[PDB]
Every structure is written in structure tokens, then in C-alpha cells.
Swiss-Prot record, chain A:
Function, in words: Exists either covalently attached to another protein, or free (unanchored). When covalently bound, it is conjugated to target proteins via an isopeptide bond either as a monomer (monoubiquitin), a polymer linked via different Lys residues of the ubiquitin (polyubiquitin chains) or a linear polymer linked via the initiator Met of the ubiquitin (linear polyubiquitin chains).
List of residues that carry Phosphoserine: 65
Shown chain mapped onto the complete sequence: 1 to 76 of 685
Chain positions found as (Microbial infection) ADP-ribosylthreonine: 66
Ranges of residues in domain Ubiquitin-like: 1-76
Membrane topology: Peripheral membrane protein
Site features described as Interacts with activating enzyme, chain residue numbers: 54, 72
Effect of residue 63 to R: Abolishes HLTF-mediated polyubiquitination of PCNA
Protein name: Ubiquitin
UniProtKB/Swiss-Prot annotation, chain B:
Keyword set includes Transmembrane: no
Physiological role: Hydrolase that can remove conjugated ubiquitin from proteins and plays an important regulatory role at the level of protein turnover by preventing degradation. Specifically cleaves 'Lys-48'-linked polyubiquitin.
Source organism per UniProt: Caenorhabditis elegans
Annotated TM spans: none
SUPFAM superfamilies tied to this protein: Cysteine proteinases
EC nos: 3.4.19.12
Protein name listed in UniProt: Ubiquitin thioesterase otubain-like
Keywords assigned by UniProt, alphabetized: Hydrolase, Protease, Thiol protease, Ubl conjugation pathway
Entry's family note: Belongs to the peptidase C65 family.
Swiss-Prot record, chain C:
Pathway: Protein modification; protein ubiquitination
InterPro entries the UniProt entry points to: UBQ-conjugat_E2_core, UBQ-conjugating_AS, UBQ-conjugating_enzyme/RWD
Compartment list: Nucleus; Cytoplasm
Any one of the GO BP annotations: postreplication repair
Residue positions where N6-acetyllysine is found in the record: 80
Keyword line: Acetylation, ATP-binding, Cytoplasm, Disulfide bond, DNA damage, DNA repair, Isopeptide bond, Nucleotide-binding, Nucleus, Transferase, Ubl conjugation, Ubl conjugation pathway
Any one GO molecular-function label of the UniProt entry: ubiquitin binding
Protein name according to UniProt: Ubiquitin-conjugating enzyme E2 N
Record's signal peptide: none
Protein origin, superkingdom: Eukaryota
Assembly notes: Heterodimer with UBE2V2. Interacts (UBE2V2-UBE2N heterodimer) with the E3 ligase STUB1 (via the U-box domain); the complex has a specific 'Lys-63'-linked polyubiquitination activity. Interacts with RNF8 and RNF168. Interacts with RNF11. Interacts with the E3 ligases, HLTF and SHPRH; the interactions promote the 'Lys-63'-linked polyubiquitination of PCNA upon genotoxic stress and lead to DNA repair. Interacts with ARIH2 (via RING-type 2). Interacts with OTUB1; leading to inhibit E2-conjugating activity. Interacts with GPS2; leading to inhibit E2-conjugating activity.
Effect of residue 85 to A: Loss of polyubiquitination of PCNA. Impairs interaction with SHPRH
Tagged with keyword Acyltransferase: no
Amino acid sequence: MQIFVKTLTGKTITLEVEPSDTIENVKAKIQDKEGIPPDQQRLIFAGKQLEDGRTLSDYNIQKESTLHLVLRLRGG
Amino acid sequence: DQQLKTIEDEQKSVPLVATLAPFSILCAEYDNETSAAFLSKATELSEVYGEIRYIRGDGNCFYRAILVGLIEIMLKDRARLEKFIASSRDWTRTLVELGFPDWTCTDFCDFFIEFLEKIHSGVHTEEAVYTILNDDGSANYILMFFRLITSAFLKQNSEEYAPFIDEGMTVAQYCEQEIEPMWKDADHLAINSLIKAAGTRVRIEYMDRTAAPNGGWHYDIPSDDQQIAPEITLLYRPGHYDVIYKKD
Amino acid sequence: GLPRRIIKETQRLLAEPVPGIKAEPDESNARYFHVVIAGPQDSPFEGGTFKLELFLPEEYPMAAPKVRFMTKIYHPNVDKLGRICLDILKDKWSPALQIRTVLLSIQALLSAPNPDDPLANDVAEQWKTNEAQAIETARAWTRLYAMNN
């Protein structure tokens, strides 16, 4: 199924995924397009941070759902 | 417990805004025996960057880094400073209209404007500016203006940025809890807002321990089709920002 | 010599009438304030007056004011030493906030004592399990401790 990933940078991308996919696999698919590595990525869906151990089905993410991508840039 | 007295005292053994230092000072924090991965990244970065300006790690480092960068452009560019002095007045009116508390948010603006005007008229020298950015009372008052426009930019554009906030928070809750208070680390969303709100252009050199694209991880904010050079460059190390400068 | 923030806030605190809240600078120390908040109508605290003390620490407004109840009060947000559990006094403090905000929020706290969760400690737990009876104790303590001279 297709899903979307919207970025703060102004871009939206599309990914081919399965509901079985772990959030790790999703980040890797983002990496294949962007270069951004998984450990630099935070994904958000419906105001909830998506956890690496879990699947898309765990969050009931559907065909043509949009995920939101932020980078890990927290600094003091 | 005088424990947070010693914690916020480790922070205060460094200046808010250090003087320039050769970039090799950053390399010397590391070595091949105990920190080989950082040493590599720093040594690589030192082919492009000649200097570093250390910012105190107190929760405000990102805001303080951007602020220092901007003030530096404006000491060297009379026109840009005129533009920034005016467009800050546009922020005052924006703040009070987006329902920020009136006299308090106004007083931060007024203090910041007067500071810029005093640069413009030449009352404040370069030396006097760095002294002001190193005096806690004044420096933090100045920094608040930047926290305020970051928050305002998000509130102005709330439906657009709402989905990038986690923990079930609304934009207003996020601003109230993570952007408006002092001592709160900046994250991507806040960083994106300040840079756009301030109308600046930033490269972040993302220095971590991982194998990286040739040249090292970096992020340009904004990133657009245009190829304008960044006017401020930051060094990000895990949890901390400093200011860096291309050679010569 | 005080910073501009405390000079301006002092002037506002003296000029602004706020129903049920009176606030005065200590005659000796300009960062020290004496505050009296009336028990609001339709709360167990009705009829009482509550003395509070407020201090603006050296870094104010970058750090929160320090506020404590002097008047003993039975409330889920106030302990035996009169220390106050309130979000805008610690983590949700911002320098855009002011003394007025804190005082108004303490006033509203007296009117809506039940904050969904037990901030502290045995008192809060008593408040959710048996409101009617917590409300009664609060009424009694108001008579015992908040009834002036």
C-alpha cells in the first residue's frame, strides 16, 4: 500500500509499505529516498510518536495515511 | 538542597558567548584513544571551518547561537540591520495581536529594539555588544524576544505545524511548555520556526559518531531549490549547539 | 538598583484593582511582596482571608516567583508548610507571565480544588474519594485558621 511522509522541510514523499512493517523498516525506506538515517528520524502520526519496535498496523495506519517526519535536533 | 546550585554552576564556569577560538580547540577535546569517532569528524570539519564560538549549554544554546549569528551579520551590514529593526516592530504588533500578554511581551520587544537601534546609531561598539550578550540579565532579556517570535511563528501557522507535535499536545500547549519558558532545549520544530520567523538561513553540521555522507551529516534550514550560501553555520553535537565560521 | 522589569511590574501591581486579591511591596525589600487573597464565594474557603508571601528571585523574570501561603489551608495543592503545587510556578513558568498571572491562578485554584490527580498528598486523595467531607474539613479549617482578628 502507499503511505505519505510529510517533512518540515516542505517535501512530501510516498512509500510502499505493508501493515506488517515495523517503524524501523519504514525509516529505512525513508532513508532509501532521502539519505536521512533511521536513528536521526522521529515519526509522528496523530500526535503520537511512532516507536521503533512496533508495526504500522499497531497504530492502525491505513492506505494513503500521512506520517510526519522530524529530525533529532534537540539541543541546549 | 543546593544541588541545582552546583548544577547551574557547572554551566556558569563558561561564558554565555565565548570569544572566537581556532577550530583546532574543538579537535583537542578528542583523541584517538578514547574518542576516535569524534576526533575524525572534528578533524574533517576543520578543513572547512577555521573558528568556533562556544555557547553555554544551559537549555538556551540554540536560541543564543542564532541570536549571536544574526547580530554578527547586522554589525557588518547596515541595510540588513535597518530591515531587522523594522521587521521586529512588525513582531510586536503580531505578538499583541496573537494574544501574547501585552506589557510583558511588549517590554521584551522594546528592550530588543533599543539594543538594535543603539547598534545602528553607533552608540554600542562591537566590544559593547559582546559584553551585553554575556551579561545574564540583559542577554536573557534579549533572548526572550527570540523565544517569543518562535512561539508566534508557530501560533500564526498552527494548523500547518500541529501534526509535527507529539505527546497529544496542541500547538499552544507545545509553545507554552517547550518554547516560551527559558532553559528549554530547542528541537527541530522550534528550530525551523525561529529560522523562518527571523528570516535567516542556517547550516547545521550534525556531528555525531556515525558513518556519514562525504563531508559529514548536515542540514540546511531552509532547504530550497535556490543555492544561496548559509549566513549562519552551527555545530550540533549530541544535545548542544555552538557557532562556527568558514575559514577566512 | 532594580531591573526595569521589577520597576514596571511594581507599578502595575500597585495600580491594578483585582477582585479579592490585594498585593503590597514590603517596605524594606522591593522584591518581597505581601499578598492577601479572599476565600472565593461558593468555595469552602468563603469568609476567610489568606495571607501569601511572594519573592522575586535574582534572575526574575527568567525564573518563577517564589510564593508560599502563610495562612494554614486545607487544599490539595498546599501542604503543611504552605508550599504550593502549581504548574506555572515551576515548569510552565515563562517570562511572558507575571505576578498577576500567578495570583489569579492561585485564586482559581481555591475555586476549583479538584485537579483530576492527587498533586499532594493525603489531602488530595481525601478530595476525590469524599468531596463532601473534604469540603467540610476545608470549611472548618477556614473557620479555625483564616478568620482574622
